[PDB]
Coordinates of C-alpha atoms and ligand atoms in Angstrom, one line a residue:
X1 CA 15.4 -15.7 1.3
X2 CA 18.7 -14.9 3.2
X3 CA 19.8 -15.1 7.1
X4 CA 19.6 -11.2 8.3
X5 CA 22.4 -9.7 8.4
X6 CA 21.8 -7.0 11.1
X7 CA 24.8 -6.7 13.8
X8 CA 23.4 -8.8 16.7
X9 CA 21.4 -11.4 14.8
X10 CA 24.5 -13.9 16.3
X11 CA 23.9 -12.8 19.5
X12 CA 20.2 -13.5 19.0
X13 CA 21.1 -17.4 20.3
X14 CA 16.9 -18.1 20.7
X15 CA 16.5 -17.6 17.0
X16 CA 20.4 -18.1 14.8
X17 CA 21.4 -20.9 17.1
X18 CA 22.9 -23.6 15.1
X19 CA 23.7 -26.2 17.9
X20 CA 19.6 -27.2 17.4
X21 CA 18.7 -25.1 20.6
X22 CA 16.5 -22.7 19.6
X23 CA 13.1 -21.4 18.7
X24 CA 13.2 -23.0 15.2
X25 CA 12.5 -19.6 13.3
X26 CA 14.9 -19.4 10.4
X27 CA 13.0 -23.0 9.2
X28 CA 9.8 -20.3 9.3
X29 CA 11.3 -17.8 7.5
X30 CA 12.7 -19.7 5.4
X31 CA 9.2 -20.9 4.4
X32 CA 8.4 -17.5 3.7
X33 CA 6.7 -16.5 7.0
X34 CA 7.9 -13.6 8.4
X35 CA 4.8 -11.8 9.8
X36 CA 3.8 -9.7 7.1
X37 CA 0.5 -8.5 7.3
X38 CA 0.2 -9.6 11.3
X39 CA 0.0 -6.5 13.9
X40 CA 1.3 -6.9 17.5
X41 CA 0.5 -4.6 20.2
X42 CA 2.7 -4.7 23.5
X43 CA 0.5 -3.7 26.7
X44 CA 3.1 -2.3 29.1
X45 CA 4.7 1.2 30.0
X46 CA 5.2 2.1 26.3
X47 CA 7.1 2.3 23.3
X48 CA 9.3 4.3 21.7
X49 CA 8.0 4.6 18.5
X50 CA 11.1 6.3 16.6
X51 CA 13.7 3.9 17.8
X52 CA 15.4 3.2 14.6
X53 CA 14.9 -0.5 14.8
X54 CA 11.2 -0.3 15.3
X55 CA 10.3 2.9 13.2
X56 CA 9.9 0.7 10.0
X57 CA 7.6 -1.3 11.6
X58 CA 5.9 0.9 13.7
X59 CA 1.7 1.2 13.7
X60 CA 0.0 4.0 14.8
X61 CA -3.3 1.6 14.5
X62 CA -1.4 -0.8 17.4
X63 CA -0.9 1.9 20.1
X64 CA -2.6 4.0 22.3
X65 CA -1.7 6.1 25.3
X66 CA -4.5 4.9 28.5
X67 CA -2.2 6.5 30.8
X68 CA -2.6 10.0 29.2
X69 CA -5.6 9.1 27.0
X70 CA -3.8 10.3 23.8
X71 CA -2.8 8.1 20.5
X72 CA 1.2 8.3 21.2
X73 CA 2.2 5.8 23.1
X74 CA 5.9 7.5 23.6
X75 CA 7.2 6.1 26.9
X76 CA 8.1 9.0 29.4
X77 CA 12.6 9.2 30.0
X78 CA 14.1 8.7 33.8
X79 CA 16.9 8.0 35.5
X80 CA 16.1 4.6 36.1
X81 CA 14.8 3.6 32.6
X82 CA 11.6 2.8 34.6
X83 CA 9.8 2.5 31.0
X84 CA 12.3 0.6 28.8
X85 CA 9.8 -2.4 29.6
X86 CA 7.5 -2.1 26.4
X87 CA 10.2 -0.9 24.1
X88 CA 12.0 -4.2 25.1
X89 CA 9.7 -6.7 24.3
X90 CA 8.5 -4.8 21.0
X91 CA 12.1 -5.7 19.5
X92 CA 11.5 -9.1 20.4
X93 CA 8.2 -9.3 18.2
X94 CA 8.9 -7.0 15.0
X95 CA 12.4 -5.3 15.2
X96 CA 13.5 -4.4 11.5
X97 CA 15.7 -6.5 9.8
X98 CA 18.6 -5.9 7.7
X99 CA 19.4 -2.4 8.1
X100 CA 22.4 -2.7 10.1
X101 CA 21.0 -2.3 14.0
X102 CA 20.7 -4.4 16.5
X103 CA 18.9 -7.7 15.9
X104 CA 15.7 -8.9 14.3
X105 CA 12.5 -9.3 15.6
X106 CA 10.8 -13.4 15.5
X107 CA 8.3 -11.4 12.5
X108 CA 10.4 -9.1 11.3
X109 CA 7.6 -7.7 8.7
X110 CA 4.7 -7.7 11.4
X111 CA 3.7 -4.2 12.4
X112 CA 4.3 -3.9 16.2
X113 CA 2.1 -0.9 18.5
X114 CA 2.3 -0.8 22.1
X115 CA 0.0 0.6 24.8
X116 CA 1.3 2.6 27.2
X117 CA -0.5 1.5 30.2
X118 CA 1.3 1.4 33.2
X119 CA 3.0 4.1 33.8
X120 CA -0.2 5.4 35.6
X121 CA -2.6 4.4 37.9
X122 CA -3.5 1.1 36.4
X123 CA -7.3 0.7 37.4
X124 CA -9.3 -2.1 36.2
X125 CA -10.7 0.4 33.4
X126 CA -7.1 1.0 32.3
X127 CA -6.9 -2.7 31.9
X128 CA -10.3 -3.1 30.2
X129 CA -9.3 -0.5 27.7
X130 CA -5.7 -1.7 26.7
X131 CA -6.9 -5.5 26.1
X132 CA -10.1 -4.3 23.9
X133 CA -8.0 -1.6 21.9
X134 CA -9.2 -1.9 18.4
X135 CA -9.7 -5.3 18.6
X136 CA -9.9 -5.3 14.5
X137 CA -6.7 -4.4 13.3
X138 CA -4.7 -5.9 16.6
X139 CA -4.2 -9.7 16.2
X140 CA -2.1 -10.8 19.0
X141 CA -1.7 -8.5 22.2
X142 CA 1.3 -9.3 24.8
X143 CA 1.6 -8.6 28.1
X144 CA 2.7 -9.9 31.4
X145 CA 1.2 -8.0 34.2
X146 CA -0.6 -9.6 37.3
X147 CA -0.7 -9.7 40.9
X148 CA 2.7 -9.4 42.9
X149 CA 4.8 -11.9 42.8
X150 CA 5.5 -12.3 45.9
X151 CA 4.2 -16.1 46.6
X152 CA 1.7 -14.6 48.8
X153 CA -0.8 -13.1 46.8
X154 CA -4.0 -14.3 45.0
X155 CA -5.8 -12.2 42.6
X156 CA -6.6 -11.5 39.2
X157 CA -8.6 -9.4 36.8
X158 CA -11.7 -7.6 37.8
X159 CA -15.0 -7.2 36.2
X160 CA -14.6 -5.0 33.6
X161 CA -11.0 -6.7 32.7
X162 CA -12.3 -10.5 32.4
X163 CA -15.3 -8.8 30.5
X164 CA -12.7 -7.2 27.7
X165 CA -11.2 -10.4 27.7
X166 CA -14.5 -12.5 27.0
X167 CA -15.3 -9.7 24.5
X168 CA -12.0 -9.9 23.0
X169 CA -11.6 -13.9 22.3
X170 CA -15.3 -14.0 21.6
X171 CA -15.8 -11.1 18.8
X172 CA -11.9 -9.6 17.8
X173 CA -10.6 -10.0 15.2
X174 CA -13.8 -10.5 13.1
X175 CA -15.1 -13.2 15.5
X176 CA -12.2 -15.7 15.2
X177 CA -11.0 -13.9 18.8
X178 CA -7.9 -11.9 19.7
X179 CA -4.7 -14.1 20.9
X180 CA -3.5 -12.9 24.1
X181 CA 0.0 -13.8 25.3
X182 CA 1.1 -13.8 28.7
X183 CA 3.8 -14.6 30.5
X184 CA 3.3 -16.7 33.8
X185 CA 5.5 -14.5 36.5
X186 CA 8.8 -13.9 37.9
X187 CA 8.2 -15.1 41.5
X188 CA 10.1 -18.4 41.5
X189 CA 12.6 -16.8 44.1
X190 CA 9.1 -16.6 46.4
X191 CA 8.2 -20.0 45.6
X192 CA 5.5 -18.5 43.8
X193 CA 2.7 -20.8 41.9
X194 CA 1.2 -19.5 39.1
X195 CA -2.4 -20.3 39.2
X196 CA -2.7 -17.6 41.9
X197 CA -2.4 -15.4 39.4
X198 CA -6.1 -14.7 37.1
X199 CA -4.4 -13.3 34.4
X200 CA -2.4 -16.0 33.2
X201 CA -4.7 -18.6 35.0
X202 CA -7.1 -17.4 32.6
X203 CA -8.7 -20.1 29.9
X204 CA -8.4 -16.8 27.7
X205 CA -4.9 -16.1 27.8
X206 CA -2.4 -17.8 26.3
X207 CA 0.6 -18.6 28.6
X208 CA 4.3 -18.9 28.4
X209 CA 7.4 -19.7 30.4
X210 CA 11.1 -19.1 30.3
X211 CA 13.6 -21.8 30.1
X212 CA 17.5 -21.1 30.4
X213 CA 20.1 -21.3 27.3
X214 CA 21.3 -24.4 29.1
X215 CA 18.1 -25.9 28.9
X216 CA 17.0 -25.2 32.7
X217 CA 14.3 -23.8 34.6
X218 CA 15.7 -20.3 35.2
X219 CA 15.5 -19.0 39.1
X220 CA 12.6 -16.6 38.5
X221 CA 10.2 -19.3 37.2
X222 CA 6.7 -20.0 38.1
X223 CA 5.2 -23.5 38.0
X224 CA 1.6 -24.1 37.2
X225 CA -0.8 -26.2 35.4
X226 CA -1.9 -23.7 33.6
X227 CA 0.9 -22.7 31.3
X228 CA 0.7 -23.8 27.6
X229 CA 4.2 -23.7 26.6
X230 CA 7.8 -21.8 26.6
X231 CA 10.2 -19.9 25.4
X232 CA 14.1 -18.8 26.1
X233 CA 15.2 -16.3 28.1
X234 CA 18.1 -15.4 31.0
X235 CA 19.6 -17.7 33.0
X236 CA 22.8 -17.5 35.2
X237 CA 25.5 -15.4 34.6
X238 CA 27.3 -17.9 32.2
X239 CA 23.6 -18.1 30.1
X240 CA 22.9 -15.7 27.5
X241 CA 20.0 -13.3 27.6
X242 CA 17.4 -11.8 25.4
X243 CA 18.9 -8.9 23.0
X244 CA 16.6 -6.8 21.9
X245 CA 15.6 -2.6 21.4
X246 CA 16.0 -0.8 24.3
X247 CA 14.9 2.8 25.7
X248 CA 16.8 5.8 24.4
X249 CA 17.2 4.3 20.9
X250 CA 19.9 1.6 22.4
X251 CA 20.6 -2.0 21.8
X252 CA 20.9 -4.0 24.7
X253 CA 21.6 -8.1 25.6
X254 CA 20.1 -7.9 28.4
X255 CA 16.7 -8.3 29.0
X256 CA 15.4 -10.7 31.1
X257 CA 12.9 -13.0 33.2
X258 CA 9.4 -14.5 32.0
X259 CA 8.2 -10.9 30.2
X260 CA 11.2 -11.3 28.0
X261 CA 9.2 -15.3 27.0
X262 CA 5.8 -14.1 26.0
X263 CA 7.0 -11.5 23.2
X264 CA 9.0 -14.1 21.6
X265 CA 5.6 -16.4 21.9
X266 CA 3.8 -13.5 20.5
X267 CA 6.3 -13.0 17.5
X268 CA 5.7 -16.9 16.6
X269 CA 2.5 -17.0 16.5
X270 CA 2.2 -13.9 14.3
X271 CA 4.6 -16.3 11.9
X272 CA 1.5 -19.0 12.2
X273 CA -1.2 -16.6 12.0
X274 CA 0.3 -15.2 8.8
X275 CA 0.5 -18.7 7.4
X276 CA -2.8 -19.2 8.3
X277 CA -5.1 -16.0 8.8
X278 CA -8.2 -17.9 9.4
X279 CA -7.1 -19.4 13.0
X280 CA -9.2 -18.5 15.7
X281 CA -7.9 -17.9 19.7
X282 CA -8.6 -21.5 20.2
X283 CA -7.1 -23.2 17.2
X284 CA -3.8 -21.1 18.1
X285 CA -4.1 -22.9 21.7
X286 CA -4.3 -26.4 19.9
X287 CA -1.4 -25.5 17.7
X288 CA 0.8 -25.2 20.0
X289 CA -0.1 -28.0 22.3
X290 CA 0.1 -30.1 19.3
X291 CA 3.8 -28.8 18.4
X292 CA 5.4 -27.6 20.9
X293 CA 8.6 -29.2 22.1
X294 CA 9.9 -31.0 25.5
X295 CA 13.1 -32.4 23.7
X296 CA 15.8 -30.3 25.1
X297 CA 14.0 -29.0 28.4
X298 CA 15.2 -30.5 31.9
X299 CA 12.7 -30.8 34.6
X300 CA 11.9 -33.0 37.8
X301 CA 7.7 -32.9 36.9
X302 CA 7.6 -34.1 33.1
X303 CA 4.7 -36.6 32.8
X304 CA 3.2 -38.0 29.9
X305 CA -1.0 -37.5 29.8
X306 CA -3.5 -39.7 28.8
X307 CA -3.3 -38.9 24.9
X308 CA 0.7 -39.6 25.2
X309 CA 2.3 -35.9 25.5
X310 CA 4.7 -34.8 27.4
X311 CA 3.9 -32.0 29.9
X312 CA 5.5 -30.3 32.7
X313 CA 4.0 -27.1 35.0
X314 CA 7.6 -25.4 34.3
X315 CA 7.4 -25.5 30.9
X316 CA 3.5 -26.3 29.5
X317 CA 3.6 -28.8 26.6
X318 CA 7.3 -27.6 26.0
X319 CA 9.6 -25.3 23.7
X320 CA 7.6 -23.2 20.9
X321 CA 8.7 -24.4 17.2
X322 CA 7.8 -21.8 14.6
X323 CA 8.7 -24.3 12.3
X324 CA 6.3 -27.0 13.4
X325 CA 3.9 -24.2 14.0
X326 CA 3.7 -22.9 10.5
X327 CA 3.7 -26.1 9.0
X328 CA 0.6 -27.1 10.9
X329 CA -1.2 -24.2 10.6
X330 CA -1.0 -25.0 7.3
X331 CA -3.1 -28.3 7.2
X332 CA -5.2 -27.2 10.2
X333 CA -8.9 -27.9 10.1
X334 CA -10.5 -25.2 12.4
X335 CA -12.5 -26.3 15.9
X336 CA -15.8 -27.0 16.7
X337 CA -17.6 -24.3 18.8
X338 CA -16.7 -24.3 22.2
X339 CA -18.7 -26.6 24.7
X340 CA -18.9 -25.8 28.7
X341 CA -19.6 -28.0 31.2
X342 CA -20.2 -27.4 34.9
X343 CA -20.5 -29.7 36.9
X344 CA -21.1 -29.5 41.2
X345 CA -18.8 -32.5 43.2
X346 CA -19.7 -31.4 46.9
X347 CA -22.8 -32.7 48.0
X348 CA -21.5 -31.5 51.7
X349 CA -18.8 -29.5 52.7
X350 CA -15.6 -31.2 53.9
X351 CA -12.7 -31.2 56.6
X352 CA -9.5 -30.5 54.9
X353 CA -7.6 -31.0 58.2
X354 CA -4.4 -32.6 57.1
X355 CA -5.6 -34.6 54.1
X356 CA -8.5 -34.8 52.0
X357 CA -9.7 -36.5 49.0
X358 CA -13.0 -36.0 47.2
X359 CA -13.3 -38.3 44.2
X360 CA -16.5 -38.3 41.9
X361 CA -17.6 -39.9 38.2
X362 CA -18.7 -37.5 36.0
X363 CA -20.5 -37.5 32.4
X364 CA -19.1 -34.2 31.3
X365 CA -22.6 -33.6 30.2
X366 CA -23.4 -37.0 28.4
X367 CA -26.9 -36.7 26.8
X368 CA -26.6 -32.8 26.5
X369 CA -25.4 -29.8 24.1
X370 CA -22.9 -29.1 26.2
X371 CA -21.3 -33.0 26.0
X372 CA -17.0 -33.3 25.8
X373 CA -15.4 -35.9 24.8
X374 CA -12.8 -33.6 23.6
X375 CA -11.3 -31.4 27.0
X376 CA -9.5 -28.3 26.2
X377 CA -9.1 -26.7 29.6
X378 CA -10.5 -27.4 32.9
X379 CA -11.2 -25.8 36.2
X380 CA -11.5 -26.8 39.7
X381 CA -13.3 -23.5 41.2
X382 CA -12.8 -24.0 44.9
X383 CA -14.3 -22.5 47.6
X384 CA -12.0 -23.2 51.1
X385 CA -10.9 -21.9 54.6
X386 CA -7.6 -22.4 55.6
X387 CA -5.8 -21.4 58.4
X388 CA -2.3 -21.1 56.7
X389 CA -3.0 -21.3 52.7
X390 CA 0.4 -21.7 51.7
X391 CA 0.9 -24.8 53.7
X392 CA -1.2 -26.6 51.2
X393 CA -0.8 -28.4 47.8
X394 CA -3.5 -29.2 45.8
X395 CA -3.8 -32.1 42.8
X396 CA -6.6 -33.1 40.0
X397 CA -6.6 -36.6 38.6
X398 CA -8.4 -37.2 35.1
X399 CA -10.2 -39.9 34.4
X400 CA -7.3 -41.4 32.5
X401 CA -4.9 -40.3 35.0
X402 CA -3.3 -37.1 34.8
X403 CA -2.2 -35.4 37.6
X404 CA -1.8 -31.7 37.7
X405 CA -1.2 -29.2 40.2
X406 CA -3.3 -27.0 41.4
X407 CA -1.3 -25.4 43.5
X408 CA 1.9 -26.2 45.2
X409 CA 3.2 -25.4 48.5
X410 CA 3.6 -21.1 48.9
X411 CA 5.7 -20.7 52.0
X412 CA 5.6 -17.3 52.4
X413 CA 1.7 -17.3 52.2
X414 CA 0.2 -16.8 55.4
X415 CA -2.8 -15.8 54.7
X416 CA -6.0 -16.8 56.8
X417 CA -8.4 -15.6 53.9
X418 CA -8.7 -19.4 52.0
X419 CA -9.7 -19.5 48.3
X420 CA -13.2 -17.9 47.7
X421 CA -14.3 -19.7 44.1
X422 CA -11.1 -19.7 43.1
X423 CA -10.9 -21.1 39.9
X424 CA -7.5 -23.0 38.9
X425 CA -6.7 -23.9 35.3
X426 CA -4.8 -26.7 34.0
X427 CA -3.9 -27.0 30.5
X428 CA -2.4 -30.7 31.2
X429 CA -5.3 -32.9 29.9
X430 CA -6.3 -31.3 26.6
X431 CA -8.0 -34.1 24.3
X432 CA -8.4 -36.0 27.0
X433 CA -12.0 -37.6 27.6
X434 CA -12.8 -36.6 30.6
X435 CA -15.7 -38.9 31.4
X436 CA -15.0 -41.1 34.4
X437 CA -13.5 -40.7 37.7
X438 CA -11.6 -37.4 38.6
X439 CA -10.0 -37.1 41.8
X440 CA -9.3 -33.9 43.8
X441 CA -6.1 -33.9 46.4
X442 CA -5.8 -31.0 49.1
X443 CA -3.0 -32.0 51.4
X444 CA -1.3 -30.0 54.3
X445 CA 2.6 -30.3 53.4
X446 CA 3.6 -28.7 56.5
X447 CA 4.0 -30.5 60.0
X448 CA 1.7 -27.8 61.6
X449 CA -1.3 -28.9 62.4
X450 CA -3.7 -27.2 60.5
X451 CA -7.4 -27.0 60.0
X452 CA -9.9 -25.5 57.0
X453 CA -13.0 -26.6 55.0
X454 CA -13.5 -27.2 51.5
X455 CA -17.5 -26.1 50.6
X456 CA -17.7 -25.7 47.1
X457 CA -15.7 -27.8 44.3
X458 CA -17.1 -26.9 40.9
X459 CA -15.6 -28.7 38.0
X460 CA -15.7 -26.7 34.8
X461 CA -14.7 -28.6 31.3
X462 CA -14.3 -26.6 27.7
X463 CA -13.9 -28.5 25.0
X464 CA -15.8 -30.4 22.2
X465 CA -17.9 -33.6 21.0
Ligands
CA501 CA1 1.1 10.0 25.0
CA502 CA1 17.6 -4.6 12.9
CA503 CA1 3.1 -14.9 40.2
CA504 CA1 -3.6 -18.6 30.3

């Protein structure tokens, strides 16, 4: 093995770093992972299949055209470089390496497709049919749309959409489930919370955020609970970017914001998959839970969980480690099938008015097949009027006492229309036990005085015994 030697591989600060701040990938390669035998496929407005840093890796089998229903997922050419989106974040996964352009991809010998998706009318059958597209050969699909990010909506995938997903984790790849990666959003400038957004919300998704080269929560983050982990991207104008392929067979160094995080997710955990084929959706979550990083990350919300790790809802569980995620993949003894538990907490509805707090002991289905002792996600689906939602916060306390967010304060949200079984995720008390006392906050962080009703509070753990 030897460092790459293409032209912008130094630029490439996430992955040739050598002041320790970086995505640990040359300790990967260097292992021999480099993605071979892995395919990617980039759900966005296309890719340009013949760019001369992509060609070699290029897969016909990865890629199809929704918008147009055709195979070629050739993005269409404009003034504004409208579709440059997918090309982007294909470099990121699988550019070529050492053939003197531009950079490298994280798995530079994984084959990268893309769907070209949304340079159309994106229905939820558009969505339905880029996430189950031959769910065989794709591995590990990345994406990063969702609802606006404009801190005021709430919404996420439709019917047929969470059914490819559900299909997808529960029968792709031969059964062992594809891996989606998604990046958590761009709306930090709208004081945007990401569990208003079902896509990366989603127990089936597998979500990433952006830290700066400094080590900082860039401007356009999101904060959630239901984030897994991060990855680097821009900053300020002093911070580096992401260099990768770009539209019109160009190189550029600078692409930016969360969607540049998830394809550099996606490339490392083609590196893990390829060092250890027989992980399924869920294992890959575990794996990087169990490895990923806080060390060099700076945030205001990092709070250690009941099992002792490290978690923050800027960053998940911390930086990705391809190192530290190869190695374990390598010793990794797959997980027990799935468990669900719901469980119903109101027995009444209840006044939110300016505070509330609704506080119940649970079994998490002692005596039953469906018992955890072992959480992987949860949910708090909750049904509530409000008469300004983005005035509110709202908190979950495990058993052992791990607070996450729900949701924080949206001040741009005005809407009257409350949360109708909204489910929010949190990813912060995995392998936990969650039998005992959890407590749910709802708190009205504005001096107006406002008024709502909470009338359905389902608690939903996954996990195993
Ligand atoms: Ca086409
Ligand atoms: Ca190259
Ligand atoms: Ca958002
Ligand atoms: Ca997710």
């Amino acid at each position: 093995y030897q460092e790459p030697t293409d032209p912008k591989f130094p630029q490439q600060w996430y992955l040739s770093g050598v002041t320790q701040r970086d995505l640990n990938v040359k300790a990967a390669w260097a292992q021999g992972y480099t993605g071979h035998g892995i395919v990617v496929s980039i759900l966005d407005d296309g890719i340009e299949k013949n760019h001369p840093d992509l060609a070699g890796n290029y897969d016909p089998g990865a890629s199809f055209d929704v918008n147009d229903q055709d195979p070629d997922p050739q993005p269409r050419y404009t003034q504004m470089n409208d579709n440059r989106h997918g090309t982007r974040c294909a470099g990121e996964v699988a550019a070529v390496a050492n053939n003197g352009v531009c950079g490298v991809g994280v798995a530079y010998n994984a084959r990268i497709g893309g769907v070209r998706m949304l340079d159309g009318e994106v229905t939820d059958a558009v969505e339905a049919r880029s996430l189950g597209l031959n769910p065989n050969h794709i591995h590990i699909y990345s994406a990063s749309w969702g609802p606006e990010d404009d801190g005021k909506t709430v919404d996420g995938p439709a019917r047929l959409a969470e059914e490819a997903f559900f299909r997808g984790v529960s029968q792709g790849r031969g059964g062992l489930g594809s891996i989606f990666v998604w990046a958590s959003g761009n709306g930090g400038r709208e004081h945007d919370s990401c569990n208003c957004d079902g896509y990366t919300n989603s127990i089936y998704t597998l979500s990433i955020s952006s830290a700066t080269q400094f080590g900082n929560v860039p401007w356009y983050s999101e904060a959630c609970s239901s984030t897994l982990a991060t990855t680097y991207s821009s900053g300020n104008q002093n911070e580096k970017q992401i260099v990768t392929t770009d539209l019109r067979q160009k190189c550029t160094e600078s692409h930016t914001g969360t969607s540049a995080s998830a394809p550099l997710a996606a490339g490392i955990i083609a590196l893990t998959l390829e060092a250890n084929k027989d992980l399924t959706w869920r294992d890959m979550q575990h794996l990087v839970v169990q490895t990923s990083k806080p060390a060099h990350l700076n945030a205001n919300d990092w709070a250690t969980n009941g099992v002792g790790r490290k978690v923050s809802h800027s960053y998940g569980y911390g930086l990705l480690d391809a190192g530290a995620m190869v190695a374990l993949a390598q010793d990794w003894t797959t997980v027990a099938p799935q468990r669900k538990c719901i469980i119903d907490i109101l027995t009444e509805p209840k006044d939110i008015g300016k505070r509330l707090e609704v506080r119940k002991t649970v079994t998490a289905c002692l005596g039953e097949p469906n018992h955890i002792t072992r959480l992987e996600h949860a949910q708090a689906r909750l049904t509530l009027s409000y008469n300004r939602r983005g005035d509110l916060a709202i908190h979950l306390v495990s058993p052992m006492g791990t607070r996450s967010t729900l949701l924080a304060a949206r001040p741009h949200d005005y809407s009257a229309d409350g949360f109708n079984d909204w489910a929010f995720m949190t990813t912060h008390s995995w392998d936990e036990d969650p039998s005992g006392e959890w407590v749910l906050e709802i708190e009205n962080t504005s001096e107006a005085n406002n008024y709502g009703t909470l009338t359905k509070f389902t608690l939903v753990l996954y996990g195993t015994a």
